[PDB]
Amino acid sequence: SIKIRDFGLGSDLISLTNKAGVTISFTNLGARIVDWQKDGKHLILGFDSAKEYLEKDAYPGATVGPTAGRIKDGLVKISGKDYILNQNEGPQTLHGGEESIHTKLWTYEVTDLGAEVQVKFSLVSNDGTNGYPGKIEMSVTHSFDDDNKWKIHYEAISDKDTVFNPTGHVYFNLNGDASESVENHGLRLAASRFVPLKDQTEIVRGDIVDIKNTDLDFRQEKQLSNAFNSNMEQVQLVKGIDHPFLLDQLGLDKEQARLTLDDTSISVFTDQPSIVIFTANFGDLGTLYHEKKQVHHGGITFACQVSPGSEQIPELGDISLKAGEKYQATTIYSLHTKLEHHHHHH
Amino acid sequence: SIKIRDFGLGSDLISLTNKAGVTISFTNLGARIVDWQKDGKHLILGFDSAKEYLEKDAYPGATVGPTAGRIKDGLVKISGKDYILNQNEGPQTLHGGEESIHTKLWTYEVTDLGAEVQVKFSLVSNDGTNGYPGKIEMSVTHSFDDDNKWKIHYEAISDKDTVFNPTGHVYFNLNGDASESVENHGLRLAASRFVPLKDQTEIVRGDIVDIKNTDLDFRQEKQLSNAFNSNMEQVQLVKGIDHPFLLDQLGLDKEQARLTLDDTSISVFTDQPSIVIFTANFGDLGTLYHEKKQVHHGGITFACQVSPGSEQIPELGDISLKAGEKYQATTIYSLHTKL
Ligand SMILES: OC[C@H]1O[C@H](O)[C@H](O)[C@@H](O)[C@H]1O
Ligand SMILES: OC[C@H]1O[C@H](O)[C@H](O)[C@@H](O)[C@H]1O
Ligand code: NI
């Protein structure tokens, strides 16, 4: 079933229920996921109205771009030319600049294919918006099927050579309560390397480092607490995790990451080369989610994209987008029950 | 009463019925008026869904800007520096450039005041959007009251020196049918001069012209047909009217124009210095409104704003907006029914 209703400020809330009873919802404010539940339990973080997003935190579950993450000094080089983008975090351009895409009302169309329902959001980034050459016609399709698969498909075309590397900023919390840390969740991730940050400003350090056999090594499933409790400089620097992890093997076919809690797991699939992992290291900020004060580590993203920092570490990728060339990206989060035995205590 | 409904593509349709039974409706797509009816007749031009607007003509009833009208070569000078805006009509920037604010979904809030209801639409135009320095936070409040007054109030603030001169692009047609010319409407307008156009590109010619005692003098009520059958080269050039008229006396308390058809009449009030009047000179285009094929002259605007063309004719005014200054503007359309 598909259902729609006003969600506040002129946005809508689109709610889908698949044949298995699993429900998921989205809003056109920032082509974002708002909730995902199983048996009355929230699997992710979200608010109950649009205004909350605009007043508390506009990133959760949003589509962010045109470029996700931080661009040192808001400086990019496009086809030999230097361009300065909107600087919204010190001299840095973070997630596309101020008042970016996550803050706009996108138009949308719903397509019912039976076992699969698609929600296609559209938006045009005009040429010059936030310093980005365009115009860029963008679309984000969120779909949910009878197999409990939530897929995100991005498409874009630009009138001018530009840069593009958007991502989906969902936060998971299998506790279903923001006030409970995710240190009790199990994490498996197919990555042997990571990108260290230079300092508190969070720009990339300039090197790529091997994390095998360190506390950041999740190739084999381990509790998140191992990371959180770590005293590695990088962990200490950000008070948790806030880094790009370079996938070892590329392809939409491989299970790149798996987040487990008791009988529930979320599997991550993507065609992107990295997963940006941020554990809501907000300290005592305590943003209220459903009347619950969020705890430090009360959430975790799996933001699949080209790693941030390619401006400095070319080896990471090229996020340039040629005029006329069609961009595409696909990320999938699949939900499973009893995939494995995970019985722990903290 | 107030009613909100899904207007298509994720947009909303907000409809307000006042004590008098009159209905007016807006959509956040473009912070725009969609309809205006009395006794089941439409007073203005509009479509039946969001899609129509996007597919057919996106300007009718919309808020257009940041700058309304045509800008020669898309060139504006800001703080002594030249800036090139998005060009979407040849080398000209028309209505803000392509995919402008009239095509975006704005957020909004409804405020019920009893005798009056207000719908406040907001949108942020990012710095650099279509070439315009910003960011510019804009709000357009459309309101409707029990006195049949439809008011539009604009507000904006920019982080940087920029240009700003939006307008409301509603088209009236008291016939209540797009297939019927507005030539039978009487028009009165308190302007003694106008701004001639250079040629078919419609950029201004460069001069200000006195229209006293010409086919374009509406200082004293007259039927449109007159203007329509004039041989004035300017009328001929455009096949109707498509010009900025300079108002004789500025101020929001003066009725600046009046459109009448039989017992029904519309009055215009504004704090703007000019009114741009365009008579739907679309030839055979035949755009479809409520399944009725539009005829050349099947509509007319009253776009209140600072006259287009100030880039060439400084005396027309100055559309600059300095960083931190608050822009404000108001236009009112009042409905009357004789007895
Ligand atoms: O709240 C927004 C967040 O977006 C990413 O996770 C970023 O790396 C974090 O450092 C933080 O800025
Ligand atoms: O519908 C678009 C119209 O907008 C203005 O009123 C302009 O003067 C007309 O020439 C036409 O471009
Ligand atoms: Ni709606």
XYZ file of C-alpha atoms and ligand atoms in Angstrom:
710
model
C 0.000 0.000 0.000
C 1.047 3.539 -0.626
C -0.013 6.377 1.473
C 0.548 10.121 1.377
C -0.081 13.130 3.655
C 1.185 16.581 4.366
C 4.325 16.382 6.557
C 4.681 20.107 7.343
C 5.856 23.345 5.670
C 4.362 22.143 2.418
C 6.250 18.815 2.249
C 4.697 15.397 1.978
C 5.279 12.111 3.700
C 5.119 9.010 1.429
C 4.697 5.764 3.277
C 5.047 2.349 1.831
C 4.210 -1.061 3.311
C 5.447 -4.133 1.517
C 3.816 -7.553 1.469
C 5.857 -8.654 4.508
C 4.463 -5.810 6.680
C 7.666 -3.791 6.714
C 6.982 -0.051 6.414
C 9.281 2.701 5.240
C 8.717 6.407 4.621
C 10.204 9.303 2.813
C 9.714 13.037 2.329
C 10.379 15.340 -0.626
C 12.137 17.743 1.706
C 15.660 16.746 0.715
C 14.543 13.450 -1.034
C 15.014 11.819 2.330
C 14.146 8.735 4.256
C 12.192 9.500 7.351
C 11.552 6.130 8.940
C 11.950 2.387 8.520
C 10.233 0.012 10.886
C 9.906 -3.623 11.642
C 7.337 -4.762 14.067
C 6.827 -1.335 15.562
C 10.537 -0.701 15.925
C 12.500 2.084 14.273
C 15.587 0.779 12.464
C 16.865 4.325 11.713
C 16.846 7.810 13.127
C 14.237 10.334 12.066
C 11.798 13.043 13.234
C 8.032 13.349 13.094
C 7.750 16.479 11.063
C 9.503 18.602 8.545
C 10.106 21.591 10.824
C 12.128 19.331 13.158
C 14.534 18.577 10.383
C 14.910 22.235 9.660
C 15.248 23.169 13.288
C 17.190 20.266 14.785
C 19.334 18.705 12.115
C 18.788 18.798 8.431
C 21.102 15.888 7.458
C 19.507 12.762 8.762
C 18.337 10.508 6.013
C 18.846 13.247 3.462
C 20.137 13.178 0.002
C 23.294 15.373 0.300
C 25.295 16.982 -2.480
C 26.103 17.927 -5.102
C 29.255 16.793 -3.357
C 29.202 14.862 -0.129
C 31.727 15.542 2.624
C 34.339 18.257 2.998
C 36.229 20.056 0.211
C 39.333 21.728 1.582
C 38.966 25.495 1.302
C 35.933 24.957 -1.028
C 38.377 24.611 -3.896
C 37.891 22.361 -6.910
C 39.507 22.169 -10.283
C 37.228 21.676 -13.204
C 38.659 21.115 -16.626
C 41.772 23.036 -15.770
C 39.865 25.761 -14.037
C 39.842 26.548 -10.361
C 36.420 27.141 -8.814
C 35.580 28.183 -5.305
C 32.426 26.737 -3.882
C 30.235 28.033 -1.106
C 32.214 27.793 2.144
C 29.963 26.790 4.950
C 32.275 25.212 7.499
C 35.164 27.541 8.005
C 36.927 27.755 4.635
C 35.531 24.355 3.909
C 32.581 23.435 1.713
C 30.707 20.729 3.585
C 27.968 18.697 1.866
C 27.531 21.090 -1.020
C 27.491 24.348 0.921
C 24.864 26.245 2.782
C 21.164 25.714 2.160
C 21.919 22.909 -0.182
C 19.858 20.152 -1.712
C 18.927 18.521 1.591
C 16.988 21.663 2.357
C 14.894 21.933 -0.798
C 11.469 20.565 -1.623
C 11.996 18.221 -4.584
C 9.116 17.371 -6.909
C 8.261 13.690 -7.124
C 6.347 10.923 -8.874
C 5.367 7.551 -7.496
C 5.433 4.396 -9.581
C 3.705 1.297 -8.408
C 5.204 -1.818 -9.869
C 3.539 -4.274 -7.605
C 6.300 -6.026 -5.728
C 8.303 -2.886 -5.918
C 7.258 0.729 -5.398
C 9.397 3.625 -6.661
C 9.605 7.193 -5.476
C 11.392 9.358 -7.868
C 12.434 12.803 -6.601
C 13.580 15.539 -8.981
C 15.440 18.741 -8.708
C 17.377 21.130 -10.779
C 20.555 22.711 -9.405
C 20.852 25.937 -11.446
C 24.126 26.892 -13.030
C 26.225 28.767 -10.451
C 24.248 27.631 -7.366
C 26.783 27.567 -4.442
C 29.583 28.040 -7.049
C 28.806 24.876 -8.997
C 28.756 24.960 -12.797
C 25.440 23.629 -14.117
C 22.648 23.476 -14.604
C 22.403 20.012 -13.174
C 19.213 17.994 -13.563
C 19.055 15.549 -10.747
C 16.940 12.703 -9.734
C 16.902 10.315 -6.788
C 14.735 7.226 -6.861
C 13.991 5.544 -3.605
C 12.399 2.146 -3.943
C 11.294 -0.610 -1.569
C 10.349 -4.143 -2.510
C 8.781 -7.292 -1.164
C 12.232 -8.599 -0.435
C 12.902 -5.835 2.105
C 15.336 -4.096 -0.069
C 15.578 -0.360 0.012
C 17.412 0.923 -3.027
C 18.682 4.412 -3.877
C 19.392 5.271 -7.448
C 20.920 8.538 -8.487
C 20.937 10.077 -11.902
C 22.290 13.400 -13.072
C 23.166 15.332 -16.258
C 24.856 18.732 -16.486
C 24.937 21.406 -19.107
C 28.528 22.149 -18.101
C 31.552 20.254 -16.856
C 31.180 20.135 -13.061
C 31.689 17.835 -10.068
C 29.169 15.402 -8.615
C 29.268 12.820 -5.814
C 26.111 12.802 -3.779
C 25.258 10.355 -0.989
C 22.430 9.268 1.327
C 22.815 10.305 4.903
C 20.714 7.806 6.756
C 21.616 6.870 10.347
C 20.866 3.495 11.708
C 20.136 2.520 15.231
C 18.863 -0.989 15.671
C 18.061 -0.222 19.287
C 15.136 1.803 17.923
C 16.005 4.414 20.555
C 18.411 7.303 19.961
C 19.173 7.349 23.564
C 20.931 3.980 23.303
C 24.367 3.750 21.891
C 25.136 1.529 18.922
C 28.280 0.133 20.637
C 26.252 -3.024 21.226
C 25.787 -3.592 17.468
C 27.945 -5.969 15.434
C 29.821 -4.629 12.463
C 31.377 -6.388 9.488
C 32.976 -4.296 6.740
C 35.047 -5.273 3.682
C 37.683 -2.661 4.000
C 41.408 -2.921 4.751
C 42.229 0.814 4.429
C 41.046 4.149 5.654
C 41.514 7.859 5.213
C 42.930 9.709 8.153
C 41.912 13.298 8.821
C 44.474 15.982 9.375
C 42.883 17.484 12.513
C 39.702 18.923 14.076
C 38.812 20.677 10.843
C 38.314 17.264 9.427
C 39.995 17.688 6.087
C 41.909 14.612 4.909
C 45.392 14.125 6.066
C 46.924 13.236 2.656
C 47.673 9.561 3.134
C 45.867 6.221 3.010
C 46.468 3.819 5.815
C 46.176 0.127 6.383
C 43.964 -0.773 9.360
C 44.261 -4.487 9.388
C 44.553 -5.841 12.902
C 43.827 -2.512 14.519
C 40.681 -1.633 16.435
C 39.241 -0.228 13.147
C 39.523 -3.594 11.418
C 35.981 -4.988 10.864
C 36.613 -7.516 8.122
C 35.528 -10.113 10.667
C 32.555 -9.165 12.704
C 33.178 -7.317 15.924
C 31.142 -5.197 18.393
C 31.265 -1.453 17.793
C 32.448 -0.912 21.323
C 35.963 -2.043 20.247
C 36.231 0.987 18.089
C 34.632 3.393 20.513
C 36.862 2.270 23.224
C 39.939 2.570 21.145
C 42.683 5.107 21.941
C 44.061 5.221 18.437
C 44.847 8.828 17.546
C 42.267 8.817 14.842
C 39.536 7.643 17.105
C 40.490 10.103 19.729
C 40.591 12.851 17.204
C 36.898 12.649 16.447
C 35.650 10.857 19.518
C 34.419 7.850 17.533
C 34.431 7.148 13.767
C 34.080 9.818 11.041
C 36.032 8.414 8.137
C 36.004 7.038 4.721
C 36.757 3.363 4.497
C 38.050 2.143 1.140
C 36.302 -0.972 -0.051
C 38.530 -3.828 -0.839
C 36.388 -5.276 -3.660
C 34.155 -3.143 -5.845
C 30.766 -4.116 -7.247
C 27.086 -3.970 -6.500
C 27.136 -7.730 -6.132
C 29.192 -7.919 -2.933
C 27.940 -7.495 0.642
C 30.204 -4.654 1.601
C 28.945 -4.063 5.128
C 26.692 -5.748 7.604
C 25.204 -4.136 10.781
C 23.693 -6.667 13.274
C 21.752 -6.536 16.489
C 20.292 -9.711 17.903
C 18.048 -11.191 15.214
C 18.127 -8.138 12.840
C 20.742 -7.277 10.239
C 21.149 -4.561 7.644
C 23.285 -5.428 4.645
C 24.981 -2.820 2.548
C 25.440 -3.002 -1.255
C 26.801 -0.297 -3.516
C 28.520 0.501 -6.701
C 30.552 3.285 -5.003
C 34.227 2.807 -3.930
C 33.957 3.904 -0.297
C 31.752 4.084 2.794
C 31.945 7.145 4.953
C 31.303 6.040 8.556
C 30.210 8.598 11.132
C 28.985 7.517 14.512
C 27.055 10.573 15.725
C 29.950 11.744 17.930
C 27.806 14.609 19.205
C 28.699 14.334 22.818
C 26.108 15.786 25.115
C 24.279 17.756 22.340
C 21.290 15.456 22.945
C 19.150 16.245 19.895
C 15.609 14.905 20.610
C 14.412 12.065 18.453
C 10.891 11.055 19.230
C 11.208 12.671 22.619
C 14.442 10.709 23.355
C 17.696 12.580 23.920
C 20.156 11.190 21.437
C 23.381 9.800 23.010
C 26.929 10.203 21.789
C 27.260 7.229 19.350
C 23.495 6.992 19.178
C 23.693 6.341 15.439
C 25.804 5.274 12.466
C 25.856 6.171 8.773
C 27.039 4.085 5.777
C 27.389 6.924 3.298
C 28.493 5.275 0.123
C 30.279 7.559 -2.322
C 33.652 8.393 -3.809
C 35.779 9.168 -0.794
C 36.123 12.779 0.245
C 39.616 14.244 -0.278
C 40.199 13.269 -3.917
C 41.168 16.910 -4.370
C 44.277 16.039 -2.359
C 44.496 12.301 -2.900
C 43.872 11.768 -6.498
C 44.133 8.000 -5.974
C 40.682 8.135 -4.309
C 38.880 8.891 -7.592
C 37.734 11.660 -9.964
C 34.333 13.211 -9.233
C 34.286 15.335 -12.185
C 31.213 15.120 -14.428
C 31.400 16.019 -18.058
C 28.783 18.073 -19.654
C 26.227 15.782 -21.274
C 27.560 12.765 -19.499
C 25.018 10.814 -17.393
C 25.952 10.141 -13.786
C 24.550 7.090 -12.038
C 25.014 5.527 -8.599
C 23.221 2.760 -6.786
C 23.216 1.969 -3.126
C 21.177 -0.743 -1.419
C 20.293 -1.550 2.126
C 18.702 -4.848 2.660
C 17.003 -6.006 5.782
C 17.228 -9.534 7.142
C 16.197 -11.485 10.180
C 18.274 -14.274 11.780
C 21.046 -13.986 9.204
C 23.493 -14.933 11.907
C 23.890 -15.633 15.666
C 24.444 -12.442 17.567
C 23.803 -12.774 21.273
C 25.797 -10.335 23.296
C 25.679 -8.162 26.253
C 27.200 -4.874 27.232
C -12.720 28.264 4.890
C -9.371 26.804 3.962
C -8.658 23.722 1.996
C -5.453 21.989 1.211
C -4.956 19.462 -1.396
C -2.404 17.584 -3.378
C -1.916 19.520 -6.603
C 0.424 16.992 -8.332
C 4.245 16.427 -8.373
C 4.279 16.841 -4.638
C 2.888 20.337 -4.747
C -0.031 21.646 -2.748
C -3.123 23.617 -3.659
C -4.300 26.013 -0.954
C -7.884 27.289 -1.438
C -9.448 30.135 0.538
C -13.151 30.907 0.615
C -14.055 34.141 2.355
C -17.292 35.265 4.021
C -18.567 36.494 0.686
C -18.324 33.066 -0.977
C -15.424 34.082 -3.124
C -12.730 31.473 -3.750
C -9.031 32.076 -4.430
C -6.408 29.304 -4.667
C -2.603 29.194 -4.711
C 0.056 26.630 -5.119
C 3.564 26.452 -3.624
C 4.852 25.616 -6.997
C 6.124 29.091 -7.865
C 4.241 30.800 -4.897
C 1.428 31.328 -7.295
C -2.201 32.078 -7.804
C -4.076 29.332 -9.541
C -7.626 30.491 -9.516
C -9.949 33.210 -8.524
C -13.698 32.663 -8.869
C -17.002 34.243 -8.092
C -20.289 32.571 -8.573
C -18.417 29.826 -10.279
C -16.764 31.967 -12.895
C -13.014 32.323 -13.193
C -11.553 35.797 -13.091
C -8.037 34.858 -14.020
C -6.126 32.331 -16.088
C -4.969 29.044 -14.617
C -4.526 25.335 -14.968
C -5.899 22.338 -13.240
C -2.734 20.645 -11.961
C 0.942 21.209 -11.338
C 1.987 19.299 -14.464
C 0.102 21.680 -16.692
C 2.081 24.550 -15.501
C 5.318 22.775 -16.159
C 4.332 21.450 -19.479
C 2.328 24.340 -20.839
C 3.344 27.712 -19.518
C 5.049 28.232 -16.239
C 4.513 31.874 -15.873
C 0.812 32.330 -15.361
C 0.055 33.450 -11.766
C 3.601 33.001 -10.637
C 6.027 34.931 -8.578
C 8.837 35.754 -11.106
C 12.299 36.973 -10.363
C 14.732 37.625 -8.844
C 14.334 40.204 -11.597
C 11.118 40.465 -13.579
C 11.241 41.335 -17.263
C 14.028 41.297 -19.780
C 17.594 42.222 -19.144
C 19.613 43.183 -22.223
C 22.473 40.724 -22.797
C 21.793 39.346 -19.326
C 24.170 42.077 -18.110
C 23.914 43.918 -14.778
C 26.472 46.035 -13.050
C 26.945 45.331 -9.364
C 29.109 47.578 -7.257
C 30.821 48.814 -10.401
C 31.367 45.217 -11.558
C 29.660 43.573 -14.545
C 27.731 40.421 -13.932
C 26.314 38.062 -16.562
C 23.039 36.379 -15.563
C 21.615 33.191 -17.025
C 20.480 33.810 -20.607
C 17.269 32.101 -21.573
C 15.840 34.120 -24.378
C 18.533 34.667 -26.831
C 21.200 36.785 -25.117
C 18.591 38.154 -22.710
C 17.802 37.147 -19.199
C 13.981 36.960 -19.017
C 12.207 36.471 -15.653
C 15.353 35.419 -13.795
C 16.841 32.982 -16.336
C 16.001 29.358 -16.882
C 14.425 27.100 -14.290
C 13.904 30.110 -12.030
C 11.949 30.635 -8.813
C 8.651 30.217 -10.545
C 9.501 26.541 -11.110
C 10.524 25.677 -7.575
C 8.409 24.309 -4.811
C 8.468 26.818 -1.995
C 7.806 25.984 1.617
C 4.789 27.668 3.233
C 2.730 28.306 6.253
C -0.872 29.236 6.533
C -2.061 31.829 9.051
C -5.795 32.143 9.708
C -6.709 35.556 10.957
C -10.441 35.175 10.675
C -11.410 37.949 8.349
C -8.131 37.401 6.648
C -6.020 34.390 5.859
C -2.404 34.529 4.950
C -0.227 32.078 3.097
C 3.466 32.786 3.500
C 5.795 31.179 0.956
C 9.561 31.082 1.471
C 12.504 30.178 -0.681
C 16.228 30.630 -0.509
C 18.046 31.418 -3.693
C 21.652 30.324 -3.155
C 24.510 32.606 -3.813
C 25.507 32.388 -7.479
C 22.160 30.888 -8.615
C 21.710 31.809 -12.291
C 24.495 34.300 -11.873
C 22.824 36.240 -9.047
C 24.918 37.052 -5.969
C 23.245 35.884 -2.750
C 22.133 34.076 -0.805
C 18.781 35.760 -0.891
C 16.094 34.750 1.525
C 12.706 35.536 -0.040
C 9.140 35.341 1.189
C 5.970 36.164 -0.639
C 2.802 36.414 1.378
C -0.419 36.062 -0.470
C -3.494 37.008 1.439
C -7.224 37.037 0.993
C -9.832 38.807 3.084
C -13.511 39.184 3.569
C -13.407 42.472 1.605
C -12.358 40.616 -1.505
C -8.875 42.067 -1.319
C -6.088 39.914 -2.607
C -2.786 41.186 -1.429
C 0.815 40.211 -2.188
C 3.641 41.281 0.011
C 7.236 40.608 -0.750
C 10.196 40.535 1.502
C 13.909 39.668 0.865
C 17.332 39.890 2.441
C 20.639 39.180 0.759
C 24.097 38.334 2.123
C 25.650 40.256 -0.726
C 24.958 43.238 -2.933
C 22.719 42.033 -5.666
C 19.617 42.962 -7.763
C 15.991 42.294 -6.855
C 12.679 43.242 -8.529
C 10.243 40.407 -8.682
C 6.560 40.511 -9.718
C 3.272 38.640 -9.742
C 2.434 37.305 -13.221
C -1.326 36.790 -12.969
C -3.418 37.103 -16.094
C -6.898 38.399 -15.864
C -9.852 37.515 -18.020
C -13.209 38.502 -16.782
C -14.813 36.618 -19.553
C -13.897 33.576 -17.483
C -12.941 31.766 -20.684
C -9.427 31.833 -22.407
C -11.102 31.497 -25.789
C -12.560 34.984 -25.439
C -10.546 38.101 -26.072
C -10.210 40.767 -23.383
C -10.908 43.458 -26.021
C -14.332 43.957 -24.541
C -12.848 44.921 -21.112
C -12.581 48.570 -20.193
C -9.311 49.743 -18.757
C -8.359 52.771 -16.775
C -4.805 53.478 -15.898
C -3.150 56.396 -14.124
C -0.017 56.632 -16.305
C 0.887 59.322 -18.823
C 4.150 57.800 -20.124
C 5.452 54.518 -21.296
C 8.635 52.760 -22.229
C 8.884 51.897 -25.934
C 10.574 48.677 -27.028
C 13.449 48.639 -29.473
C 12.180 45.861 -31.642
C 11.051 42.300 -31.636
C 13.660 41.211 -29.110
C 11.626 43.348 -26.793
C 14.537 45.042 -25.077
C 13.817 48.640 -24.306
C 14.350 51.215 -26.918
C 16.157 53.636 -24.596
C 13.682 56.452 -24.168
C 10.588 57.419 -22.249
C 7.521 58.405 -24.170
C 4.574 60.622 -23.321
C 1.279 58.936 -24.216
C -1.067 61.733 -23.482
C -3.834 61.665 -26.089
C -2.722 58.544 -27.984
C -4.345 55.151 -28.312
C -2.512 54.180 -25.180
C -3.922 56.860 -22.892
C -6.192 55.070 -20.356
C -6.159 57.884 -17.963
C -9.849 57.947 -18.654
C -11.556 54.628 -18.911
C -11.585 53.049 -22.376
C -12.175 49.707 -24.091
C -9.175 47.617 -25.001
C -10.269 47.174 -28.562
C -9.213 50.717 -29.058
C -5.724 50.029 -28.093
C -5.991 46.820 -30.024
C -6.973 48.477 -33.327
C -4.459 51.238 -33.068
C -1.901 51.797 -35.759
C 0.744 53.047 -33.322
C 3.948 51.468 -34.385
C 4.511 50.248 -30.861
C 1.125 48.463 -30.837
C 1.902 47.046 -34.180
C 5.272 45.806 -33.183
C 3.981 43.492 -30.551
C 0.456 43.000 -31.802
C -1.111 44.232 -28.650
C 0.501 45.649 -25.551
C 3.711 44.455 -23.906
C 5.002 47.462 -22.075
C 5.924 49.182 -18.906
C 3.661 52.097 -18.078
C 4.941 54.739 -15.752
C 2.532 55.559 -12.961
C 1.844 59.266 -12.433
C 1.575 59.217 -8.677
C 3.300 56.758 -6.443
C 1.738 55.341 -3.325
C -0.218 52.356 -2.125
C -3.353 54.388 -1.365
C -4.107 55.314 -4.966
C -6.072 53.145 -7.377
C -3.601 52.833 -10.248
C -5.546 50.813 -12.671
C -8.985 49.388 -13.061
C -10.170 46.531 -15.235
C -13.914 46.270 -15.814
C -16.365 43.982 -17.586
C -20.031 44.633 -17.001
C -20.805 44.483 -13.208
C -17.393 43.138 -12.320
C -14.313 45.201 -11.860
C -10.721 44.817 -10.554
C -8.710 47.579 -8.950
C -4.943 47.646 -8.642
C -2.877 49.191 -5.890
C 0.895 49.041 -5.521
C 3.897 50.752 -4.012
C 5.779 50.124 -7.183
C 6.438 52.812 -9.807
C 5.390 50.863 -12.831
C 2.930 48.425 -14.253
C 3.924 46.089 -17.076
C 0.926 45.327 -19.229
C 1.026 42.322 -21.545
C -2.120 41.259 -23.420
C -1.397 37.548 -24.183
C -0.200 38.348 -27.723
C 0.282 34.607 -28.506
C -1.187 34.540 -31.953
C -2.384 31.004 -32.746
C -0.456 29.351 -29.971
C -3.796 28.204 -28.486
C -2.581 27.124 -25.046
C -5.312 25.062 -23.374
C -7.004 26.411 -20.254
C -9.711 24.292 -18.771
C -9.984 22.640 -22.123
C -10.537 26.053 -23.767
C -8.047 27.049 -26.499
C -6.474 30.371 -25.708
C -6.909 33.188 -28.169
C -4.486 35.960 -28.965
C -5.371 38.637 -26.405
C -7.187 36.124 -24.221
C -5.590 37.592 -21.077
C -3.851 40.623 -19.560
C -1.383 41.258 -16.909
C -0.789 43.956 -14.390
C 2.817 43.200 -13.296
C 3.708 45.795 -10.730
C 7.384 46.444 -10.444
C 10.224 48.806 -11.268
C 10.164 49.094 -15.042
C 12.384 46.786 -16.958
C 15.149 48.595 -18.811
C 16.809 50.509 -15.979
C 20.146 49.114 -17.090
C 19.844 51.441 -20.061
C 17.523 54.118 -18.669
C 18.655 54.971 -15.134
C 15.799 57.371 -14.610
C 13.505 54.366 -14.455
C 14.921 53.529 -11.150
C 17.448 51.262 -9.489
C 16.922 47.672 -8.730
C 19.928 47.192 -6.589
C 19.691 45.481 -3.243
C 22.614 46.092 -0.831
C 23.849 43.374 1.534
C 21.767 43.420 4.698
C 19.032 45.730 3.407
C 15.487 44.451 3.652
C 13.534 44.673 0.420
C 9.722 45.021 0.850
C 6.966 45.385 -1.721
C 3.231 45.273 -1.929
C 0.588 44.897 -4.518
C -3.158 44.600 -4.059
C -5.872 43.361 -6.306
C -9.315 44.255 -5.155
C -12.538 42.738 -6.457
C -15.835 44.752 -6.727
C -19.305 43.902 -7.918
C -21.709 46.620 -8.863
C -25.294 46.839 -7.522
O 26.281 16.059 10.767
C 26.935 16.026 9.491
C 28.011 14.973 9.502
O 28.197 14.607 8.117
C 29.221 13.628 7.927
O 28.945 12.504 8.757
C 30.482 14.292 8.399
O 31.641 13.537 8.121
C 30.365 14.421 9.884
O 31.604 14.935 10.332
C 29.301 15.458 10.172
O 29.676 16.740 9.665
O 4.605 34.889 -20.745
C 5.843 35.513 -20.783
C 5.526 36.990 -20.959
O 6.098 37.620 -19.769
C 6.092 39.057 -19.808
O 4.775 39.514 -19.507
C 6.671 39.604 -21.126
O 6.564 41.016 -21.278
C 5.998 39.011 -22.355
O 6.729 39.456 -23.511
C 6.130 37.509 -22.272
O 7.520 37.144 -22.352
Ni 1.201 17.992 -0.087
